[PDB]
């Protein structure tokens, strides 16, 4: 679930537009979706053009720099689950030497805690970038999350649950020995 999330780029939906007064109608000027490394315009130049964050061109740029800033912490979380996944399976191959389940439980718990401070720093870095811009009566600005953000949240709950269940498999096996 995390590997789909880090690879894909459907994280943030940003829309900017200008209203038409006395008619109760709104007309967009730009729309895009972004990820940790790849940006593709849904309605930018009314075209599906795709640039990386390094290939720049206002506030939409400044949001994109903060998404690149919050990069490392999901990569740390995937690295610790991959170590925890290997030690879990080789413990299933060899039921003796019961220490393999307990150490793998620690890598799962440290994975989820790294994912939380990833999301907290991500959401904070997005919120203040909407805050600094000057308000106008004729301009509306919106934001929305994506399905890759939903997968990372689900990836937290299953990783914490497997880290709990690995401790019980340690205790029940050590009691049987």
């Amino acid at each position: 679930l995390l590997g789909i999330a880090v690879s894909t780029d459907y994280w943030l939906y940003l829309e900017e537009g200008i209203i038409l007064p006395q008619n109760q109608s709104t007309e967009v000027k730009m729309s895009l979706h972004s990820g940790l490394w790849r940006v593709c315009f849904l309605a930018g130049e009314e075209r599906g053009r795709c640039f990386t964050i390094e290939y720049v061109m206002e506030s939409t740029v400044n949001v994109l720099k903060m998404i690149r800033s919050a990069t490392p912490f999901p990569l740390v979380s995937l690295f610790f689950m991959f170590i925890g996944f290997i030690l879990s399976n080789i413990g299933h191959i060899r039921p003796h030497r019961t220490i393999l389940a307990f150490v793998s439980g620690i890598f799962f718990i440290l994975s989820g805690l790294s994912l939380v401070v990833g999301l907290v720093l991500y959401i904070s870095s997005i919120n203040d970038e909407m805050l600094n811009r000057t308000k106008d009566a004729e301009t509306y600005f919106n934001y929305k999350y994506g399905w890759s953000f939903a997968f990372a949240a689900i990836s937290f709950l299953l990783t914490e649950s497997a880290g709990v269940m690995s401790v019980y498999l340690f205790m029940k096996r050590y009691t049987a020995e």
């Binding site: 203040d128 805050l131 600094n132 000057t134």
Partner: protein, 180 residues
């Protein structure tokens, strides 16, 4: 640039109370826990429930509004437990009431208000137009404040000077309050 709502700091939650109050709360926390351990020791009234490690946990529970498992059973202990309960009732009520003042009434302050403040700081850069009587005023000025401002504007990298008036206004709007 006009002062606006800014990015809140990471430690902005401890803004309604001053820093001298927060250090006195810590110092009073240690002082009560030492007193509660000592007086319970030489005055017993069986098992010494209130140790130095237990007394820190008792006073921490009373400040954080939670209940504690053990209670003092002597007269001298219950006076210490009684007064420390009254202390935390006022402070937590003072923290709640001051946040209601901040969130209701918004007052914003400008960093600078005079030319002598700009000379005594290096956070905000300041510049003039390149050709005109404005730059010529700072050039031949024998006033001590204005002479200090010319030494900064001359030896500044990147150049604070602009070409036109509209370019100078555009740098003010886009530097997030770092250019005057």
């Amino acid at each position: 640039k006009k002062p606006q709502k800014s990015k809140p700091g990471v430690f902005s939650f401890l803004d309604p109370l001053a820093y001298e109050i927060w250090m006195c709360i810590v110092f009073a926390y240690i002082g009560v826990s030492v007193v509660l351990f000592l007086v319970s020791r030489f005055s017993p009234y069986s098992t010494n429930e209130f140790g130095i490690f237990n007394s820190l946990w008792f006073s921490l529970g009373a400040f954080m509004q939670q209940g504690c498992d053990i209670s003092p059973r002597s007269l001298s202990g219950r006076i210490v437990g009684g007064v420390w309960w009254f202390f935390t009732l006022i402070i937590i009520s003072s923290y709640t009431a001051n946040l209601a003042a901040f969130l209701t009434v918004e007052r914003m302050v400008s960093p600078i208000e005079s030319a002598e403040d700009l000379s005594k700081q290096t956070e905000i850069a300041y510049g003039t137009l390149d050709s005109g009587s404005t730059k010529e005023f700072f050039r031949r000025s024998k006033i001590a404040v204005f002479d200090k401002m010319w030494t900064y504007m001359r030896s500044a990298e990147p150049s604070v000077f602009v070409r036109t008036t509209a370019e100078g206004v555009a740098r003010v709007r886009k530097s997030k309050g770092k250019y005057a």
